[PDB]
Amino acid sequence: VKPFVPRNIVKKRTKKFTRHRCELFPQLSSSWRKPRGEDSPVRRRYKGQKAMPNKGYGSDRRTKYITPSGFKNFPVNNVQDLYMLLMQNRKYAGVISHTVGAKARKAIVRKAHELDVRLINGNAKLRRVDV
């Protein structure tokens, strides 16, 4: 299956918005927190400080949620879930759940190859061989 590849995919920003001064304290997480301080230099938008997220960074609605391969990810848990992705072959790729065991993964991978449904965490060799 070959997806509809976008001509160009543009990300406005690649770096993540990290918390202020999270590198100086081991207990502080790097997830973003909005600073609320009267004298805060990040809040007041000084020139050499970190940036805060806002609506201008939003991704182009045309290429949003599209992975570099050109597919969209849909979680898959069993063989029956593979039949929802059969018709929309070129738009969606299945993602096998983390907790699905190795015994059940054999049936899913075997069935997906027959149906020509792309999986992102299958076996690489089976994807390489063409029929």
Partner RNA sequence: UCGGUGGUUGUGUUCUUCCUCCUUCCCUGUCCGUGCGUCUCGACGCUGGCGAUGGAAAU
Partner RNA sequence: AAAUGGAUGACGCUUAAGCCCCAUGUGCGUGAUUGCCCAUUAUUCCUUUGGUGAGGGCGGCUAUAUGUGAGAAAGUGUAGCCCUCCCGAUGUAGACGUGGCGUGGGGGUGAGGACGAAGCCGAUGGCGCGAGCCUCGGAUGGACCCGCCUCUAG
For Mg ion, the binding residues (CB under 5 A) are 38
Query: Residue 112's CB: how many other CB atoms inside 10 A?
Result: 23
| Separation CA 50–CA 109 (nearest Å) | 45
Query: Residue 126's CB: how many other CB atoms inside 10 A?
Result: 12
Does residue 98 bind RNA (CB under 7 A)?
Answer: yes
> Residue from 25, 27, 61, 124 that binds RNA (CB under 7 A)?
61
The site partner of 22 among Mg ion, RNA, Na ion, none (C-beta below 5 to 8 Å per kind) is Na ion
Does residue 101 bind RNA (CB under 7 A)?
Answer: yes
Is there a contact between 89 and 77 (Cβ–Cβ < 8 Å)?
Answer: no
CA angle 117, 124, 109 (to 5 degrees): 45
Q: What is the binding site for RNA (CB under 7 A)?
A: 4-5, 7, 11-13, 16-17, 29, 31-32, 36, 38, 45, 47, 53-68, 72-73, 75, 77-78, 80, 87-91, 95-104, 106, 120-121
